[PDB]
Amino acid sequence: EPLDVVATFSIIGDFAAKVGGDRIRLNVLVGPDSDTHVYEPRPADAIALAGADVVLTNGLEFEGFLTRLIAASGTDAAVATLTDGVETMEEPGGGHYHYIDGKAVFHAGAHDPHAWQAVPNAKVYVQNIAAAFCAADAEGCAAYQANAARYIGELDALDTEIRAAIAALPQDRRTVVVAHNAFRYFEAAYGVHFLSPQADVAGLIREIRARNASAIFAENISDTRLLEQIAREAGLPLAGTLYSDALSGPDGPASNYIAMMRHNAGAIAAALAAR
Ligand code: NA
Numbered sequence: 142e143p144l145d146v147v148a149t150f151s152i153i154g155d156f157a158a159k160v161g162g163d164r165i166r167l168n169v170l171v172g173p174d175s176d177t178h179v180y181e182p183r184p185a186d187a188i189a190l191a192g193a194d195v196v197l198t199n200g201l202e203f204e205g206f207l208t209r210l211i212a213a214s215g216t217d218a219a220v221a222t223l224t225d226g227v228e229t230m231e232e233p234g235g236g237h238y239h240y241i242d243g244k245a246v247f248h249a250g251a252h253d254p255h256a257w258q259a260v261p262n263a264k265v266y267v268q269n270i271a272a273a274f275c276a277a278d279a280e281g282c283a284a285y286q287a288n289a290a291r292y293i294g295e296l297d298a299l300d301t302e303i304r305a306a307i308a309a310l311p312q313d314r315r316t317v318v319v320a321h322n323a324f325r326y327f328e329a330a331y332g333v334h335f336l337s338p339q340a341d342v343a344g345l346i347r348e349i350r351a352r353n354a355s356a357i358f359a360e361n362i363s364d365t366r367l368l369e370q371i372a373r374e375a376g377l378p379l380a381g382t383l384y385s386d387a388l389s390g391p392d393g394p395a396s397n398y399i400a401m402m403r404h405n406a407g408a409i410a411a412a413l414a415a416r
C-alpha cells in the first residue's frame with residue numbers, strides 16, 4: 142500500500158519487519174535502550190497511530206491508551222494483541238479468589254509480559270503478526286505468509302540451538318541470579334533457573350547458597366544498586382548482561398531478536414559451564 146504498521150516496542154518491531162518486508166512502513170514507539178519497561182505511553186505516540194493501518198501490541202496493559210488515541214484520530218486501525226494464543230504466566234503471587242455467587246472465583250491479576258523469552262512463543266507472535274497483516278492487506282498475504290514461514294524456520298533452529306546448549310550443561314549447574322527477573326518464560330521453556338529479589342536479600346542469599354548459583358547477570362530494568370548489593374553479599378561474580386525487554390542498538394550484541402536470544406542463551410551457558 143504501503144501497509145502502515147506501528148509496533149509498541151523494538152522486539153515486536155523486529156518481528157514486524159521480518160514479516161512485512163518491503164510491503165510495510167514501520168514505526169516503533171519505544172526503541173532500543175529506552176528508560177521504559179517494555180512500552181509506556183507517550184503523547185507523541187499519537188502522530189504514529191493516527192496514520193496507522195495495524196498496531197501491534199504485546200498484551201492488554203495499555204491497550205486503553207492506544208485504542209483511545211486511535212478513536213480520537215478517526216483512523217480505524219486493527220490492533221493486534223500478539224500474546225493471543227500464547228500461554229501467558231501470572232506474576233509471582235498474582236492470583237486471589239472472589240466469592241461472586243456462591244463460588245470462589247479465581248482472579249488472574251497481572252500477567253508476566255516477557256513471553257518472547259521462550260522461542261516457541263515468538264513463533265506465535267510472528268504467526269499473529271502475519272495474520273494481522275494478511276488481514277488488513279489481502280493482496281500482500283502470500284508475501285507476509287511466506288516471510289513468516291521462513292522466519293519461523295529460523296526461530297525453530299534457534300530454539301533447538303538453545304536446547305542443545307543447555308542440555309550440555311551439568312545437571313547441578315542450572316541456576317543464575319538477576320536483580321529483576323524478566324526471564325521466567327526462558328526458565329519455563331529451557332532447563333535453567335533464575336533467582337531474583339521477590340533486609341530480604343538474606344532470603345535470596347540463602348536460596349543462592351542452597352542452589353549453588355554460579356553467577357549474576359545485569360539487565361536494564363533493575364537499577365544497578367540492587368545488583369551490586371547482591372553480588373557483594375553473595376560473593377558471586379558478575380558474568381555479563383542479559384537483554385530483557387529491548388533490543389540493543391544496531392552495533393550492539395542484540396540488534397535483532399535472534400541475536401538477542403543467541404547472546405542471552407550463550408552467555409548463560411558460558412557462565413554455567415565454568416563459574
Ligand atoms: Na527497558
